Design a protein around this ligand. Structure first.
Ligand SMILES: Nc1nc2ccn(CCCCCc3ccc(C(=O)N[C@@H](CCC(=O)O)C(=O)O)s3)c2c(=O)[nH]1
Ligand SMILES: NCC(=O)N[C@@H]1O[C@H](COP(=O)([O-])[O-])[C@@H](O)[C@H]1O
Length: 200
């Protein structure tokens, strides 16, 4: 399965995916890394690994559909089968999400459905949970319909901040995200006709 990784920043999840896809038994190959922001560290990791990179500045487009079209064109150029969102900070348009339904994964730093949206760690700390975690799910038009592939719980320690909590959660992301990619790329997991997760 040919994979694109969309990033917006540091790219530690990207790096975890690169490491796992270079394993002999990997069913996924990363063929293109797309950032919406230039000069982010995730682009260096991609280039260091020999993976083509494309910057597609969302700010240069009129709306999301024009921006998403630029991305979709690169995905077609590279004959992509699967799209991993790994720190991607742009909400995607409905038709794009529809087109890639059942083919686009996302890592989210909470135990969905808890703490949706952009500041999950902030919300978790404000709420005072002692257990949080991360979630790999298929992307639907809203974070609510996205079918969940894997999750891993992570403890919240007393005194945790966004910096320390996100550091601990990221260790779990770097585990379940490569595993979830391997599950989908190998055909072991897919969206069924029900639209719910199907294990083969
Ligand atoms: N249709 C759809 N699209 C996408 C893209 C990722 N996910 C799944 C990941 C869900 C994680 C939560 C969030 C991700 C991005 C957020 C956001 O607010 N982006 C602002 C810029 C904010 C900023 O950087 O200051 C914007 O795009 O305007 S929130 C989805 C999805 O499930 N459905
Ligand atoms: N909007 C979703 C979101 O906030 N996802 C989070 O962004 C980080 C990306 O880090 P990375 O660039 O080092 O992989 C990850 O911690 C991921 O859980």
């Amino acid at each position: 399965a040919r994979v694109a990784v969309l990033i917006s920043g540091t790219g530690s999840n990207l790096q975890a995916l690169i490491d796992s896809t270079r394993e002999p038994n990997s069913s996924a190959q990363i063929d293109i890394v797309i950032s919406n922001k230039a000069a982010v560290a995730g682009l260096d990791k991609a280039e260091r690994a020999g993976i083509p990179t494309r910057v597609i500045n969302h700010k240069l487009y009129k709306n999301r559909v024009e921006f998403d079209s630029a991305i979709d064109l690169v995905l077609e150029e590279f004959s992509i089968d699967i799209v991993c969102l790994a720190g991607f900070m742009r909400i995607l348009s409905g038709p794009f999400v529809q087109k890639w339904n059942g083919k686009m994964l996302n890592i989210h730093p909470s135990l969905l459905p808890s703490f949706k949206g952009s500041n999950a760690h902030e919300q978790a700390l404000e709420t005072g949970v002692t257990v949080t975690g991360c979630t790999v799910h298929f992307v639907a038009e809203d974070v609510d319909a996205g079918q969940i592939i894997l999750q891993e719980a992570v403890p919240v320690k007393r005194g945790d901040t966004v910096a320390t909590l996100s550091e601990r959660v990221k260790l779990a992301e770097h585990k379940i995200f490569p595993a979830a990619l391997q599950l989908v790329a190998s055909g072991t997991v897919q969206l069924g006709e029900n639209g719910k997760i199907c294990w083969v």
